[PDB]
Amino acid sequence: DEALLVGTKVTTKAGDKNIENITLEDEVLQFDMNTKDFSYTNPTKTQKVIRDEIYHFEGAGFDQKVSPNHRMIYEQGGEIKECLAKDFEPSEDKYFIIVEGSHMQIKRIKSTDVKITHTKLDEPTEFHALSVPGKSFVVTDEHGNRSVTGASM
């Protein structure tokens, strides 16, 4: 429902762990939406759901494959905002959050540089979700790029 495609890697203190393998005992790199600070915290819940539609955001080192009602996290003005994937409308003033290198350096890319595909999948597949106190956490795509994505509330 508010989930990420199976095999999405979640950045933890130890490395980049397949989301379907995350437990409540893992130390996940969260991003606090109120403070913009990075920290490792335990997820308070994990979710497994099977769906057949996906929103694929792709551009400029940003790649997320999410459920329709997954919370997308972006910066606008000086504030960190959320929007459901199916509702997100790119604009020059809304920026997705990339985390570059080993020092957790924030790079903000224009959402208008990110293509959005809404796909009906040929067959159902598993999507997974985490809840963390900061309400967002860092995922790593197939090309080693890290970005901030919404947690389930």
Residue numbers in the entry: -1 to 151
From the reporting publication:
To increase the chances of capturing the intein with active site residues in relevant conformations for splicing we decided to crystallize the precursor and fused the AceL NrdHF fragments with inactivating C124A and N146A mutations. Five native flanking extein residues were included at the N‐ and C‐terminal sides, respectively. Expression of the fused intein domain in E. coli without the inactivating mutations resulted in quantitative splicing with no detectable precursor protein remaining, thus suggesting that the artificial cis‐arrangement did not have an impact on folding and function. We determined the structure of the AceL NrdHF precursor at a resolution of 1.9 Å. The intein adopted the typical HINT fold with the expected localization of the conserved motifs in and around the active site. The asymmetric unit contained two protein chains that form an inter‐chain antiparallel β‐sheet involving residues A12–K15 and come in close proximity at residues E140–G142. Electron density can be observed only for the two N‐ and two C‐terminally flanking residues in chain A as well as two N‐ and three C‐terminal extein residues in chain B, suggesting that extein residues further outside were disordered. All intein residues showed electron density including the three residues (GSH) that were inserted upon fusion of the IntN and IntC fragments. Cys124, in the structure mutated to alanine, was indeed located in the active site at the expected position within the motif C2 motif to allow interactions with both splice junctions and to act as the branch point residue. The distance of the thiol side chain to the carbonyl carbon of the N‐scissile bond would be only 3.0 Å, sufficiently short to trigger the initial N−S acyl transfer without additional larger conformation changes. Our crystal structure shows the M70 side chain centrally located in the hydrophobic core as expected.
